Amino acid sequence: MDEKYVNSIWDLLKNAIQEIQRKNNSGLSFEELYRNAYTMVLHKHGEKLYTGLREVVTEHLINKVREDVLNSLNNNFLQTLNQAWNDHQTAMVMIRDILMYMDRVYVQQNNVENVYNLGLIIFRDQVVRYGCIRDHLRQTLLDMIARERKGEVVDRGAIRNACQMLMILGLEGRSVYEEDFEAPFLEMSAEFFQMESQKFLAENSASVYIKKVEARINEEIERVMHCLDKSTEEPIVKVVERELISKHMKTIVEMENSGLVHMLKNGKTEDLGCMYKLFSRVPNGLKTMCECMSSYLREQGKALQGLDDLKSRFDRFLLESFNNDRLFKQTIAGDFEYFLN
Amino acid sequence: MDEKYVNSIWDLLKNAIQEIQRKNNSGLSFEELYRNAYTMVLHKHGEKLYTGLREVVTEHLINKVREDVLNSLNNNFLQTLNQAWNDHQTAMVMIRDILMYMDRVYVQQNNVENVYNLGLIIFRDQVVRYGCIRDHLRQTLLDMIARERKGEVVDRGAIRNACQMLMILGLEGRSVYEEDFEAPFLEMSAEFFQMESQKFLAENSASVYIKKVEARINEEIERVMHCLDKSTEEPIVKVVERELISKHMKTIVEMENSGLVHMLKNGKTEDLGCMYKLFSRVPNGLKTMCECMSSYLREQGKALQGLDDLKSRFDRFLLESFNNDRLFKQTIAGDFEYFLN
Amino acid sequence: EAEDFECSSHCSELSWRQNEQRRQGLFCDITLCFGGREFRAHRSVLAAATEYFTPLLSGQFSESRSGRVEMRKWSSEPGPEPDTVEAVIEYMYTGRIRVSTGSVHEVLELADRFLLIRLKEFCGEFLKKKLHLSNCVAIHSLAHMYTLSQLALKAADMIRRNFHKVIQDEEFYTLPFHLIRDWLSDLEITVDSEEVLFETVLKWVQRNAEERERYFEELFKLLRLSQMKPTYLTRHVKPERLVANNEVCVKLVADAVERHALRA
Amino acid sequence: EAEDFECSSHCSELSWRQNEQRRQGLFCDITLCFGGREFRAHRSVLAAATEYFTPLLSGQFSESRSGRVEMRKWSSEPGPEPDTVEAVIEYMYTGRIRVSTGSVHEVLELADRFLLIRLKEFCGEFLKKKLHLSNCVAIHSLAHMYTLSQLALKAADMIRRNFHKVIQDEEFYTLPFHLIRDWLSDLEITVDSEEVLFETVLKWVQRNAEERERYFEELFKLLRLSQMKPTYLTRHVKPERLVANNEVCVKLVADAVERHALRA
């Protein structure tokens, strides 16, 4: 009907939306509010409604919610942030329901986000990614993971709660989680692991090192399961595989008074079998072991009736420690065919 | 379980059945009573239950219900009888429900009547057909219909209520209604109509008589619709058709200073058209009119240039009063072909 | 080993038996009022039938505590015909409905309002068949109001092709302002001359003069005065009291005559 | 003219959405307790699923006012397994259930008790397939208890054909008195000699001696002592303490020996 009557309807819904926002769901009639929203969209006033919706939410989250999270930065930040997120989710569900006819008719037909998805975008842009908040959340989640790794006891629950939220604001996508948390996390992790690798090489045996690497891989998988998105397992492991294994491949195998050659000489089968299973992860991993072996085996066979003893000893390793691998088999065989000439 | 435990269960159900009978449905737990009935049939004690059921009902209707109906014979009989019937129907529904598992499992498998059908048989045999009751109900329904016919104002409602009941006790069949009410009703009706016919012939014109017959047919159809079973329409009409039309066919047509010949002579078309529509009901009905006509038409044509006037006059009757009937057409034609010889 | 069972008949029966309950009032949870008659129904069924009833009956709003829902403000004064309401409620139970040539309007109202999308779909596929030369203007106003986009296009195309004749029948002069506005600014419309469009603006505005006069100025702006003959603009357009009153359009009708003289 | 609509998918969806409600407790009317766990459900659905729930929930009995139903006295001590109860309740909503080699016993209990005849039917057609040499005595005791007449006959016939071997396995010595009674008086049974039947009466009665001794006299009367060898009756039947105690059977064992001497 007339411009004034339409503004009557919108004033009614605006007050209802604000009441919901203020946690006052009870006093409201679902059919009255739904009919008013319906009457607007039915009489082609959907844009007025949608534009109005985008305002009432934007204003609430900027003036009340952003402020709350900011005022509680150095006083229970993540908690003040999850409560902000929960209160929002709860409100946006009720807002989406009174405006259900707009979601089904207008939103579809006019290439715009749906009420809940719009609510998510505003919370994302105005609260979770507000620079000061965006940064303080990134530094918070990372300082916790760094403290945890360095021994301290931290709240994995608050960490999973923020990660779920970061994932959800991605709008059925990891866009927000990836750049706001994952990428900075992976970066600080690699810097940690690189330093960790330097300590363990300087004071632990190759067997101990290889064990400590497996232990680190297990810890990082165990961390993802308990407080990050399941999709971070492959990235973080590859960062452990890169910094601990891949970057120090020749260093590990060649370790003096330890390593492949000493393991082959002192016959420590399971120890070099452990090396095989770890070096089978990284590219050129097994190659390095073959190269180290071929260098030694050719130098040992060059010294050699007793080559039946050599063949049998390496046959045992290949079958037990090297899982009868095609590459190792060909390498051992290649070195034996080399002695003929 | 043991004989005593089974008798514990049955004593519980017997009391529940009697409480229901006494109008005390409320205090009872449906699942407790149903489980007890179930436990008996499940443990193959169905016959004890069924035999017990047949007793508790038989005893109630003989000792309490039959007595009530008898004590109120000359004091609101039909009402005391419908209330007996309603209270029964109501109880038997609740009895059938607590014993639902017996109806589905035992009753089926052991070639016996179902709880509700058994209840109907006992009410039928012990109350509605108890000789003194059987007779007083038959005399009641008939004295009413006789009073109604003779002018008086009677309760068609009480009459339909008893007829529905009589029909229902037929066990999806009219066996009880047919012999307890219909047959005596049809008999007393024929005796009435035979006397009615004698009065109307002795003092009314053939046209008036024919009208009074149609009026009687309509009254008797109107009576069946309002207070008897719809299935009594064909029998009672055939009794009106037999006693009023069929038995006095030649008498009506030949009525002096009235009737077919006088209607044909004085040219009263619709009047003999009325006769046609009534005599078309009964067998040999139209034959009698043709016979009466052929006797007259042959005597009139035997008297006869003016036979073009005769042909045209009878052509008009045949088309208007006789609905251009094949039998009448052939009869008129036959009589005309007769004059040639 | 195990085995799965499927009673095909089951759910068809279950739904029908629940309807039979509703009709007797058996186990009815909620009471649906449409005019000051009311229809008793089952919260479980209604909520299962459409996304609408779930938040209503949930527990976050007055209706859950009420145990009654006042369905108000319908196109029909005391609400839709009870027969059409019972028909649609039954559909929510059974998924079976008969839509008459009359029923379809009120059915589409409820179907659309109560978010019964597969029933709304049907009405759309129904009217698409019942679409004709007379049917087209009334069906377009339906398809446009109840967002039946596929049907709106087929109804619009038949109006664009037969515009010259649709403006002859009174059916068009019923249309709301926003639809007149959208038709005048529609370019694929097929009329004999642009001068006829003015005669239709003047005809339509005259009907509900008291409420419709406000729009005229906006509607006159839509008129492509360039494609109109200068003889017509000077003798028929300029002297109209409706155009002589507003000074915004006397300037536009003056520039239009100015432009034609300037075309030489 | 009019047109009828049928949303084929509809009732299948409606039922499933109502189950999804029940699982969340949404709009649940009644609470069904089976042991001191309880299952929340919908009065409308339950009543629609079976003739049982209609009088219960109607309003003529305590349960309607209660809003809770205490399902007591089941073959399993604290009632059937909750998984089997949820399975059957879901079936009342959806008409879909999976019956395991284990499930079938408790499923048939509930199906039969709660008058779910098409589910009971399935269990009957299921066990008919799973019927074997070991399965036959246990399946007969089921089919006999839960009035599965078609199955009882097929199970009985396999027991009558393989009686001589069924009395070897302990499975038979579980059977209740009324079934022993009915087997002894069954004429189409196939055993080597009538003397073996006595050895099975003595074996079965010995098991739960304290409760089973009462029956022995009735069971001994069923024994066709005419078809037994006089050497056996004098040396093995007559000296049994179980037969020497009752004086009713010492007379019957005496007439039996009397009849054999009288046959010469």
Contact C34, D64 (CB under 8 A): no
- Mark which residues 11-50 of D lie under 8 Å from B by CB: none
- Give the nearest partner residue to D149 out of B28, B44, B109, using CB atoms: B109
**How far apart are alpha carbons D98 and D96 in whole angstroms?**
7
Buried b (16+ CB within 10 A) or exposed e, B207-218: bebbbbbbebbe
How far is C8 from chain D, CA to nearest CA, in Å? 7
How many H helices and E strands in chain B? Answer: 20, 0
SS3 letters for chain A?
CCHHHHHHHHHHHHHHHHHHHCCCHHHCCHHHHHHHHHHHHHCCCHHHHHHHHHHHHHHHHHHHHHHHHHHCCCCCHHHHHHHHHHHHHHHHHHHHHHCHHHHHCHHHHCCCCCHHHHHHHHHHHHHHCCCHHHHHHHHHHHHHHHHHHCCCCCCHHHHHHHHHHHHHCCCCCCHHHHHHHHHHHHHHHHHHHHHHHHHHHHHCCHHHHHHHHHHHHHHHHHHHHHHCCHHHHHHHHHHHHHHHHHHHHHHHHCCCCCHHHHHHHCCCHHHHHHHHHHHCCCCCHHHHHHHHHHHHHHHHHCCCCCHHHHHHHHHHHHHHCCCCCHHHHHHHHHHHHHHHC
**How far apart are alpha carbons D200 and D184 in whole angstroms?**
10
Question: What tokens appear for C124 in the block?
Answer: 């759309």
Among D31, D62, D66, D148, most B C-beta atoms within 10 A, so best to mutate, is D62
Fold of A127-248: 5 helical Cullin repeat like (1.20.1310)
How far is A101 from chain C, CA to nearest CA, in Å? 8
Contact D102, D84 (CB under 8 A): no
Technique behind the model = X-ray
Contact C18 D57 (CB under 8 A): no
| Rounded-to-10 torsion of CA B239, B245, B248, B249 | -140
Contact A65, A122 (CB under 8 A): no
Q: Side by side, which strands form the sheet with D38-41?
A: D38-41, D30-33, D69-70
Question: What tokens appear for C199 in the block?
Answer: 């005669």
Buried b (16+ CB within 10 A) or exposed e, D181-191: bebbeeeebee
Please compute Rg for chain C using Cα positions.
Answer: 26
Pairing of strands D38-41, D3-6: unpaired
Q: At CB < 8 Å, which residues of chain B contact D?
A: 25-31, 33-35, 38-39, 42, 44, 94, 97-98, 100-101, 104-105, 109
Q: At CB < 8 Å, which residues of chain D contact C?
A: 1-15, 17-18, 21, 26-27, 29, 42-45, 47-49, 57, 91, 93-101, 103, 118-119, 122, 126
Contact A31 C60 (CB under 8 A): no
Contact D117 B39 (CB under 8 A): no
Contact D55 B105 (CB under 8 A): no
**How far apart are alpha carbons C150 and C138 in whole angstroms?**
16
> What residues contact B261, with CB distance under 8 A and at least 6 apart?
B253, B254, B292, B296
**Parts of chain A belonging to CATH 1.20.1310.10:** 1-126, 127-248, 249-341
Length of chain C: 264
**How far apart are alpha carbons B184 and B138 in whole angstroms?**
8
Query: Of B276, B139, B291, B142, which is closest to residue B207 (Cα–Cα)?
Result: B276
Please list every residue in chain B followed by a chain break, i.e. its C lies more than 2.5 Å from the next written N: 304
Query: Of C172, C174, C177, C253, which is closest to residue C215 (Cα–Cα)?
Result: C177
- Give the nearest partner residue to C115 out of A25, A33, A104, using CB atoms: A104
Contact C117 A104 (CB under 8 A): yes
Contact A282, A245 (CB under 8 A): yes
What DSSP designation does C72 have? -
Contact D215, D177 (CB under 8 A): yes
Q: Where are the alpha helices (DSSP H) in chain D?
A: 10-24, 43-49, 53-58, 62-66, 82-94, 103-113, 117-129, 135-145, 149-161, 163-166, 177-184, 195-207, 209-212, 216-222, 230-232, 241-245, 247-262
Helix (H, G, I), strand (E, B) or coil at B204: coil
Whose tokens are 């097994």? That residue is A286
Question: What tokens appear for D198 in the block?
Answer: 């006595």
Whose tokens are 């050497």? That residue is D231
Q: Bridge-partner residues for C33, per DSSP?
A: C38, C70
Resolution value (Å, 1 decimal): 3.1
Residues in C closer than 8 angstroms to D10, CB to CB, are 15, 94-95, 118
The CATH number given to A249-341 is 1.20.1310.10
Whose tokens are 């297990």? That residue is A218
A1-126 is classed in which CATH architecture?
Up-down Bundle (1.20)
> What residues contact C239, with CB distance under 8 A and at least 6 apart?
none
Question: What tokens appear for C53 in the block?
Answer: 């009833």
- Give the nearest partner residue to A30 out of C63, C73, C115, using CB atoms: C63
- Enumerate domains of chain C plus CATH numbers: 10-156 (3.30.710.10), 157-262 (1.25.40.420)
User: Quick check: D263 contacting B, CB < 8 Å?
Assistant: no
User: Quick check: C51 contacting A, CB < 8 Å?
Assistant: yes
Contact D115 B38 (CB under 8 A): no
Residues in A closer than 8 angstroms to C116, CB to CB, are none
**How far apart are alpha carbons A235 and B286 in whole angstroms?**
107
Question: What tokens appear for B39 in the block?
Answer: 């436990």
How far is D232 from chain C, CA to nearest CA, in Å? 47
